[PDB]
């Protein structure tokens, strides 16, 4: 019902619209109340090495050479733009990943805001990962934020870590 764009990742489209992205950090952050469930045995990863990270959680005791994790990134957006238009670029950063294949995609609104979610598999370091990637363009009062959540697992763990990744993906919530 909502048609996706093909040219330009969400970030590049906002750049080209003249918007500035300012990475937020959780301590002190009030504009939004974000729930990111933390499943049993997962913990916050101090010192993640995800640029612009707002919070990174992970299951450090997993099997797999790949540690299952969720990454949340929150940008305050400076400049005017139409969010519903920007959001139609929401799949493109995932669809550029090596060997991307899609399992689920939706551009339905999420908690009342324009949003995209795409889920699927891709290759990285000789390993197949399963991932779920949501962008939310949220409004708090007079500001706009891009909230982005990735939840990734090795494809070999996608069923074993299913209850964790599910509680994260489906418990996720963004409130102004
Ligand atoms: Cl704030």
Curated annotation (Swiss-Prot):
Keywords: Signal
Organism domain of life: Bacteria
Family: To M.leprae ML0031.
Stated name of the protein: Proline-rich 28 kDa antigen
Full-length numbering of the shown residues: 97 to 272 of 310
């Amino acid at each position: 019902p909502v048609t996706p764009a093909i040219s330009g990742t969400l970030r590049d489209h906002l750049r080209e619209k003249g918007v500035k992205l300012e990475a937020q950090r959780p301590h002190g952050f009030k504009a939004l109340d974000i729930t990111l469930p933390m499943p049993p045995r997962w913990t916050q990863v101090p010192d993640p090495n995800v640029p612009d990270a707002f919070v990174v959680i992970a299951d450090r005791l997993g099997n797999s050479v790949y540690t299952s994790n969720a990454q949340l990134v929150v940008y305050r957006l400076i400049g005017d733009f139409d969010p519903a238009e920007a959001i139609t670029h929401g799949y493109i950063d995932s669809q550029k990943l090596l060997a991307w294949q899609t399992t689920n995609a939706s551009m339905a609104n999420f908690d009342g805001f324009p949003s995209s979610i795409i889920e699927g598999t891709y290759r990285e370091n000789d390993m197949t990962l399963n991932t779920s990637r949501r962008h939310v363009i949220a409004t708090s009062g007079a500001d706009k934020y891009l909230v982005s959540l990735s939840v990734t697992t090795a494809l070999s763990q996608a069923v074993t870590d299913g209850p964790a990744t599910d509680a994260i993906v489906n418990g996720f919530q963004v409130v102004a």
